[PDB]
Amino acid sequence: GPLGSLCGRVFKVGEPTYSCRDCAVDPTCVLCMECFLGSIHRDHRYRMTTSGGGGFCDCGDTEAWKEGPYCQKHE
Ligand SMILES: [Zn+2]
Ligand SMILES: [Zn+2]
Ligand SMILES: [Zn+2]
């Protein structure tokens, strides 16, 4: 997987991405669905944006999230 990423996911065409409006630096900070659903951000105000192809999951990037950087799979 991409060097420097804990999750490793690169988004498929049509695959949902999740940015937490309450915690993300900006809308480019995203989680894949499995990371999002196992994260504290599932209860926050969020944005589901479908990837057009490409981009990558930011799970475990402690600079991307004001709180809750690791989902349960990546704890
Ligand atoms: Zn992920
Ligand atoms: Zn994760
Ligand atoms: Zn959040």
UniProtKB/Swiss-Prot annotation:
Covalent crosslink: Glycyl lysine isopeptide (Lys-Gly) (interchain with G-Cter in ubiquitin): 66, 73
UBR-type Zn finger ranges: 6-75
Binding-site residues, Zn(2+) 2: 20, 23, 41, 44
Expression (tissue specificity): Broadly expressed, with highest levels in skeletal muscle, kidney and pancreas. Present in acinar cells of the pancreas (at protein level).
Binding site for a peptide: 56, 58, 61
Superkingdom of origin organism: Eukaryota
Annotated residues for binding of Zn(2+) 1: 7, 32, 35, 57
List of residues binding Zn(2+) 3: 35, 59, 71, 74
Protein localization: Nucleus; Chromosome
Quaternary structure and partners: Interacts with UBE2B; promotes the UBE2B-H2A interaction and the ubiquitination of histone H2A by UBE2B and UBR2. Interacts with RECQL4. Interacts with TEX19; does not lead to TEX19 degradation and stabilizes it. Interacts with CASP8. Interacts with ATXN3. Interacts with UBE2O.
Family: Belongs to the E3 ubiquitin-protein ligase UBR1-like family.
Biological role stated in the UniProt entry: E3 ubiquitin-protein ligase which is a component of the N-end rule pathway. Recognizes and binds to proteins bearing specific N-terminal residues (N-degrons) that are destabilizing according to the N-end rule, leading to their ubiquitination and subsequent degradation. Recognizes both type-1 and type-2 N-degrons, containing positively charged amino acids (Arg, Lys and His) and bulky and hydrophobic amino acids, respectively. Does not ubiquitinate proteins that are acetylated at the N-terminus. In contrast, it strongly binds methylated N-degrons.
Free-text note on domains in this protein's UniProt record: The RING-H2 zinc finger is an atypical RING finger with a His ligand in place of the fourth Cys of the classical motif. The UBR-type zinc finger forms a pocket that mediates recognition of type 1 N-degrons. It exhibits preference for arginine in the first position, and a lower preference for lysine and histidine. It binds N-degrons with a methylated arginine or lysine in the first position.
Protein name (record): E3 ubiquitin-protein ligase UBR2
Source organism of the structure: Homo sapiens
Residues represented out of the complete protein: 98 to 167 of 1755
